Symmetry: C3
């Protein structure tokens, strides 16, 4: 059984009129796997959210299914789903009644609604969060204690030089006694391997912000995820990289015409036909 945005109660007894409040509490995540026998309880319809008992009574007409829609549960005293800590965006009507909600943890175009604090997202690119490649490796090197890995974000320790970055073969020749180099910004640029005296280059791991490519919410809900400055080989529809990074959820049409939505650094995006395509401008 799929919960079509069913369990949304009033977190506090505060009156709000025509606002979009952001609440951090225990709510039922939208489109969650619900058994078909805090916790959510529904019986075909008297919905109950226990945490404090919330109740709601809605007339229904269906068989062997869960009703689709939205219903706010009211505090009573001070199908089963489980509650999780989520950040919800509640829409309060002019009478204080919650008419709609957005769970900003399920899929893209939902975090964009939280970032913009609106149920209608315009046509464009929006930077929602960032992305840092976490090092899934840890190597330590000491002279004559693990193997040397390269071309991957790894926490290294070269005879006391603790750092975080990706190692690669450098074309710089150090002096016979110098053990590590430094750039203009007073940061460790290259290190000398205590074994085999190999010179390795240190590069900071991929640091970029994620962006959602949306052709407005009035046309369709199909969005594309855009990563800035990172390669998709390190990123956890169609996967393809571009000049600005990797774009998930679009196509790689070889055509080229006028730019529609500038995603940044060359390539632009557009909506065509029921499919999002990318083209070089």
């Amino acid at each position: 059984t799929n919960s079509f945005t069913r369990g949304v109660y009033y977190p506090d007894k505060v009156f709000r009129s025509s606002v979009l409040h952001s609440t951090q509490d225990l709510f039922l995540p939208f489109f969650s796997n619900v058994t078909w026998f805090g916790v959510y309880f529904a019986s075909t319809l008297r919905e109950f959210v226990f945490k404090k008992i919330y109740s709601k009574h809605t007339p229904i007409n269906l068989v062997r299914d869960l009703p689709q829609g939205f219903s706010a549960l009211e505090p009573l005293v001070d199908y089963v789903g489980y509650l999780q800590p989520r950040t919800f965006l509640l829409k309060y009507n002019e009478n204080g009644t919650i008419t709609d909600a957005v769970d900003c943890a399920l899929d893209p175009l939902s975090e964009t609604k939280c970032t913009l604090k609106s149920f209608t997202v315009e046509k464009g690119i929006y930077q929602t969060s960032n992305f840092r490649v976490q090092p899934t490796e840890s190597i330590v090197r000491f002279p004559n204690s693990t193997n040397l890995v390269k071309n991957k974000c790894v926490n290294f320790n070269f005879n006391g030089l603790t750092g975080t970055g990706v190692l690669t073969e450098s074309n710089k020749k150090f002096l016979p006694f110098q053990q590590f180099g430094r750039d203009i910004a007073d940061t460790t640029d290259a290190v000398r391997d205590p074994q085999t005296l190999e010179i390795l280059d240190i590069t900071p791991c991929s640091f970029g912000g994620v962006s959602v490519i949306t052709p407005g919410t009035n046309t369709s809900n199909q969005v594309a995820v855009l990563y800035q400055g990172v390669n998709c080989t390190e990123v956890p529809s169609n996967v393809f990289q571009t000049r600005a990074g990797c774009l998930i959820g679009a196509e790689h049409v070889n055509n080229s015409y006028e730019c529609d939505i500038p995603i940044g650094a060359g390539i632009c995006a557009s909506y065509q036909t029921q499919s999002i395509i990318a083209y070089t401008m």
Copy 2:
């Protein structure tokens, strides 16, 4: 006996030339009720201020009265009036002698001299201090412990909602479970009375700055006190309210002509004849 600005001694042994220094010490307030038998002592004339003994010897020619003028008392060793903590503005001559002083606690147009730090106030409006209506009441409401007061600044406590404001009947209908409302600025806007379930509106009490309406000190000393944003029913010659607040010390002439001194928000003030009048611009 009236002290015509008599007791003003040298607070410290510091030499100053052509300055207007502000001193916070124990001085005799100007135009104070002096007995006709720290303390001020005068005998018709050898004035003494004890606190440290200050002395002054001035030739006088009068009977059954106190001499009018100004005389600075000099430190001697390390009619009777009493000293109070006052903020005085002393005028030092080119030889270090105090020639005049202003007690900025007696009447309006004297605090203006301290605010401007000058013995000559120009023609215009000057904001000297502020004014906050202190709540002369404290009510506490709990469900089934004092009476409910409205239309007056009162400290309230609605089942744990401690605040300060004026309560009035609101036209907003809360939900059957919501107990208090909140505006866009994340402040308590309305509360629900735990008794009779009446909805009350919370409004911050009158916050405004006082202003002195003076037609310059070269013409006359008659000034008018202007309160901004407050009603004279809550404010502790002629009393009348205007669009910018309450104006004390003027008239309410129904005539209208060109503006002379803009007191703010419409109405202007002018000097006519030996009387200060107000007129809508």
Copy 3:
């Protein structure tokens, strides 16, 4: 024996390419008196700097002298001169080898190289440091305990008035009871001597910044030291004062023509012929 910039070792084992690093460590000062038998050790050539043993082997061809040039000593393990704490400016080549160094504590035009962080100083005036006349005297005066000194920077204490300045005869007459005066900036301007009741004027001692007058390093190395706002009677080639202060290392040519290098406040400086001259603009 004179050390012609001989002892300069690698402070740390860090690789740098085409940079000018500033190091604070124990180095041999340039042009220092070296015996002709941390410490510097050279033998005609295998130079050794002990601190950690640094070594260097350079072919030489000379007799009864010390070789002139520059040679960087490399770390080996973990004529005699002594090491002192100095701030050196090291020039790293594209291979990490130190090719030249500047000791910014020997003479002027060397501190300018540190201030500009370059081995080539342009033609102009550069403010390197400041200059405050330290009081070489301390007098204390109490009423009926040292002699009264004037026209010299001295720490004074007049019956509890501790301060620092130069005392001189003031033409201001205090009141018979006032002991010290104060200016507009709320600072002690004048004091009354508890003995003989003499009025003295307090003036802050000479505060100014030093400046190096250099006609560029591409033409010659002869520079002139310029002090701003101080008189040479208090300052520790040809000494002469000007409108902007005292200028050491130049001439006082009475001629006057177009300005070449504005040293500030009137007088300008120029290079003529092998001699630095100053002239009123």
